[PDB]
Amino acid sequence: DEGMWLMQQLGRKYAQMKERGLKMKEYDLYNPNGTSLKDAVVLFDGGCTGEVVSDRGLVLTNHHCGYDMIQAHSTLEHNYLENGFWAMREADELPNKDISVVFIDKIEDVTDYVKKELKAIKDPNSMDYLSPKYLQKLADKKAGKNFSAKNPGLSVEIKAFYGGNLYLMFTKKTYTDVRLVGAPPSSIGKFGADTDNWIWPRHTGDFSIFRIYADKNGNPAPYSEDNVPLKPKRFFNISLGGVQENDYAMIMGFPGTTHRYFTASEVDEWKSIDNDIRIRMRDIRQGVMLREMLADPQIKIMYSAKYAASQNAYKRAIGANWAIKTRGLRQNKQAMQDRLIAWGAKQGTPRYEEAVHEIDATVAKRADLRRRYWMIEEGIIRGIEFARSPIPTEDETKALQDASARKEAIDKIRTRYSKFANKDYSAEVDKKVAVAMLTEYLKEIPYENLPLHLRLVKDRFAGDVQAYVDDIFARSVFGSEAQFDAFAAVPSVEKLAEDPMVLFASSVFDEYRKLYNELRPYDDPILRAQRTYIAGLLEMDGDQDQFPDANLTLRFTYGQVKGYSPRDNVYYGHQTTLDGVMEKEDPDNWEFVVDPKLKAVYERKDFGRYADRSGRMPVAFCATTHTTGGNSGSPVMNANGELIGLNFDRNWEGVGGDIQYLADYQRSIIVDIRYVLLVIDKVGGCQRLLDEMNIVP
Amino acid sequence: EGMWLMQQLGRKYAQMKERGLKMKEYDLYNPNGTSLKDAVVLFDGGCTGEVVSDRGLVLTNHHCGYDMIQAHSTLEHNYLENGFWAMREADELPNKDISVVFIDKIEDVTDYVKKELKAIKDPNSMDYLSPKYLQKLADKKAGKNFSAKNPGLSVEIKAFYGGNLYLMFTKKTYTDVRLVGAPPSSIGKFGADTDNWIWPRHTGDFSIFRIYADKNGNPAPYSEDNVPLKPKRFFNISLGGVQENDYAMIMGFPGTTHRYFTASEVDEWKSIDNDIRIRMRDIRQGVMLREMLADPQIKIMYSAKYAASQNAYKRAIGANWAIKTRGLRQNKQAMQDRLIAWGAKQGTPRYEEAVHEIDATVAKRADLRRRYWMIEEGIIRGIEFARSPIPTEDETKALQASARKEAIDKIRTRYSKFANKDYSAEVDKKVAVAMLTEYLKEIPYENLPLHLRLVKDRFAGDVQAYVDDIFARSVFGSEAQFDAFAAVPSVEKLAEDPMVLFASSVFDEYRKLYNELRPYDDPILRAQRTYIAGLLEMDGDQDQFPDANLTLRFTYGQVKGYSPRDNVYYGHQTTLDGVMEKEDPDNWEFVVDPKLKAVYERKDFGRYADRSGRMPVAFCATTHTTGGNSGSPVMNANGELIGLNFDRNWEGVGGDIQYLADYQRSIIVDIRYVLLVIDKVGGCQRLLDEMNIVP
Ligand SMILES: O=C(COc1ccc(F)cc1)N1CCCC1
Ligand SMILES: O=C(COc1ccc(F)cc1)N1CCCC1
Ligand SMILES: O=C(COc1ccc(F)cc1)N1CCCC1
Ligand SMILES: [Cl-]
Ligand SMILES: [Cl-]
Ligand SMILES: [Cl-]
């Protein structure tokens, strides 16, 4: 609903944005033929957003966005992940291998061009209209003969929007020498850690600092000791005016995916298959894992990351199912499609109703297969560690059946066994997880639909899942180190072919691939019908109050700094303070440890010009902007386009917002720029970064 | 802020009127006439109640009338789960061992008691706080035939302000109090233990009783000839509801507070009482919950024991949060330093000497008190086999006449009560191994109960082996082991039984510590009499209330929410919409009564919903309440009933030592929700009709 707008849509939205508080001129925010604020936004490392905040190429993004780079430069002598990092001179800034920043140099509507090229249709069912290979061939044809050679650092890309009803060509400028400049300690950068993931109120200082480097002329160049900081076209001014409740706020960034044009049948499928299976299976997996972690401190160390990784999409699915149950998402999709069908009936065009019917029929037809796919994926592929145990390759089996190539096969199988049964793998914990996961899987999936090896639970083990799992480990070459070494000393292909763990792993992966291959053909009729469906919605209600689905391209969103009521008699305000960090401090809980320098700043009220009018130190705020994954690190702007914060999360109540925006619950969780500048200043003591920024009173 | 004596109403009236009170002083409390105070009762010795009709109808909490609802519940008519609604007065159920106490008269007898005390001689006598001594004075003042000359009436004298003020209460007690109505437990206890001490709250915590009496309205025990009481005063029910900042007041019987604790007593309360209870109960509850989650039969057997352990555990967590964050220790220290500076200026050193005596006594009893709480939390309440059978002297002097069978039948009865339908020896062994490992780490060998010395001496430090051996060799270790003993009982078998020796040994140490600690209470009590006398002489009997002591008090404040933490606000009122948000059909605590769910769906709120069409459930107020105030009437600026107090938020449990204006709230069930449940859930129109409901 309140959307993720194309840069092209700024003109038609500008008057509403101005009426909601926007004060800057339209072309100062986005101008297709000149420098604008859009030129200070970057796609940071392929999946995050960033922003240029100085005339020397300084870039701000989230701490969780720059996390891998902070970790790659961290050692026992200089643990930057734990203590932070503050380069005191430009020469001290650390280079990063495999990093990139993408500027969106130009954006152009190429719809008529693509649609004319598509008219050369050798099959009306062709999926070339959505093919990256096909669209790249059109982008190259339009850009010219050797565009990348004649314009180094530039590249061209065409993307489909609105289900193939609109196409845009992006001219991108990519820089690959992006150095680490500064980062707060993890105690600030990820204060809530996993406990506060998707949570508002939030007290996390989620930021990190980088710098784009380039050749002498400001052109992209790979890492070189001769590289000089980039003088950019445009950079954000930092505001110290802060935020007030109801203030206008806007974001530019790269939201990844949404499903705003789902039919009511796709919402039901998302709930009853995708979300219910993921919720049920992960709750079983996590329940066994947590009991083992709480009983053995060594198991807690080995399984903490696996547990946290499983919980992230589990929490998302819980938040999504809450919106489906309470916010009428299914009903609003049904009303949307009924309105189009009634309009099509009045216009004498039945193709829109036929398109919704095709989507419904495809959803209803793939139901059993999709249920079986999610059941095996959540239950076994993700749920059971020994599902990803070593499977001897075709060439490994061939090698073991008269040359020195036998020792090569054993060394390769050993390397994979050592990665599977690593320092964090417990066979006992895995057997307990598998017994609970398989009991549920065997209750849901009938004998005729089971992976071939799982048929042995009924046929050979008289229904005893525990005995079947015990037997896999007791007899398998991968059941223990001593069992592998005995095999490695005298390896036979016939031992591997009958190995209970190899057979289980092969069998479950075979069933997983068979289901994937059977389900793949159902995607195309839905995609083709969505092109007709979205064309109708656009022709009926216009390319105005319905935004194109997110597709990792540059979008803008606007709203207000506003809290919300999560439940009866509870209100969460629009702004958190440093006081809230101190309330959450728990010295013996690694997630809620408070940095001693920050604790002292709070005690002494050493807030400088960064505190609010009441002398309180702001930390984070929330806004009615419409964001999703991909928007991490996005610049948050004032009514004047000045930087007031960085987007870093969204509350769980708004995760259903990828299908239907939730005005009374959905909020972008943003780190206040005053808190960012406080941490750089009083925690990092990196005055040179403050000095190179243009800070407005 | 306080829990004021009825006598202090005159002194507080102007401030109450400035805060919004509209009723005349003597209409609320009149020392020589009828007033609203006459409609308040002490319900069943530990709760408050209120008369709401000219036919003796009484409202109190559901958790206050819980035992009576349960005593009348059968498999055929389960009133606890289904609710109860007597459709005629003759259908109201009598209750054995129930009482309602009216506070007929209250008088200051300070000079009388202080003159009588002057005859003591021993300056360290504790008669000034002795219920037996004070009752002898109460009887002497009332007369040598008071209860016979004034039927239903009794007198009682209590100490206040540490023995600096005394009041005599004339009480009228009724023992025929019948069950009239109760909502189902899904309404009466909606939050169940999850929402205990929690605001926001969505629980309709009420039950309905009726006082019966003889033909003249005089107290009489249960009789089929008893007629409902026509009281001299009852509350009018308001349907005007509440708004944020509205004046609210409560009358009730708060039990205990510790408003005059020294800073050393706050430290002791934190570092001994609360930390030990928190640490020990967390170990006990952790083992119990693991076992309950792994075996559904263990969950059935241990649910009540788990819930009972959690209640004071949650209280201690809330209390320690206030000590850590609200500066309770610091404010007591400032209070005592101010008195000491004032006593230095006046030339009277006795106040500083009194605070010093309290500090020295606290410091001296520290190790013993730590040992007492450690054994009490760790073993006496932590381990079930600590309360296993110990053969009496009469029982041993029977097994060494044919009364050997009677001794075995008595020991068997106690064994059967210990190892009952809810007792698991396996769960108990696991709880004991974890509890004893912690206890053995905290209590040194020389301070251990004698049998626990065997962990180091006989079992090479293996707690698991020591516990396994207790059950493997004890006659109370299993039914088969008891039966083998019962067939061939010898006193030598009992005298060497590892479970009997453990149980005896831990109870001996528990009694020895109790007896060693008891003498330390008296110097603190005597010094508190001097300490509070100084505080009263210095800052007056005006902004410092006497500690609660289960006597009638009033408190006033406003209907107001609060901010529990940064960027979070809890408003002053919950709604029926909040009950529906919490509904979880497969969680017994959050099941919603189908009749109530239908009322919400159809918006069948009648005259009970607010101006916006939303149905209120509960509200909170800045009144100062504690345990004993459950069921208390909550009044308007006009003295009309707007709700019943039923709980207080955990953030305010430290309020028994220092009132917390920004966090402490009384959790009250809205009277409009009470009437909506009587009407649309119970269908008991006769109860609505007998109440005086004001628009
Ligand atoms: O308003 C529109 C198109 O709107 C957009 C065109 C390009 C773009 F990048 C974004 C929007 N139309 C109304 C009549 C049919 C076309
Ligand atoms: O309170 C919850 C879930 O709470 C969280 C969900 C996800 C998350 F990341 C954090 C909390 N619910 C009550 C209604 C059904 C869901
Ligand atoms: O949130 C809590 C405790 O919460 C409850 C305590 C008791 C209770 F009955 C219910 C909740 N705390 C945060 C700061 C340390 C204590
Ligand atoms: Cl058509
Ligand atoms: Cl909404
Ligand atoms: Cl009366």
Concise description?
The structure is a homodimer. The first copy, chain A, contains 25 helices and 22 strands.
- State the shape of chain A: globular
Return Rg of chain A in Å: 28 Å
List the bound ligands.
2-(4-fluorophenoxy)-1-(pyrrolidin-1-yl)ethan-1-one, chloride ion
Regarding quaternary structure, what we see is homodimer
Q: Helix content range of the residues of chain A, please?
A: 40-55%
Count of beta strands of chain A: 22
Describe the structure.
The structure is a homodimer. The first copy, chain A, is an alpha+beta fold and 697 residues long. Chain A folds into two domains: 1-256 and 543-697, no CATH class; 257-542, no CATH class. In chain A, 44% of the residues lie in helices and 15% in strands. Chain A contains 25 helices and 22 strands. In chain A, strands 2, 3, 4, 5, 6, 7, 8, 9, 10 and 11 form a ten-stranded antiparallel beta sheet that branches. In chain A, a hairpin with a 3-residue loop joins strand 2 and strand 3. In chain A, helix 9 (264-295) packs antiparallel against helix 10. The longest helix of chain A has 32 residues, at 264-295. Chain A is globular and about 75 Å long. In chain A, 45% of the residues are buried. Strand 16 (570-572) of chain A pairs antiparallel with strand 15 of chain B. Bound molecules: 2-(4-fluorophenoxy)-1-(pyrrolidin-1-yl)ethan-1-one (3 copies) and chloride ion (CL) (3 copies). One chloride ion (CL) is lined by residues 349-351 of chain A. Chain A: Keywords: Aminopeptidase, Disulfide bond, Hydrolase, Protease, Serine protease, Signal. Chain A: It comes from Porphyromonas gingivalis (strain ATCC 33277 / DSM 20709 / CIP 103683 / JCM 12257 / NCTC 11834 / 2561). Chain A: Its EC number is 3.4.14.-. Chain A: The active site is at 64 (charge relay system), 206 (charge relay system), 632 (charge relay system). Chain A: It is found in: Cell surface.
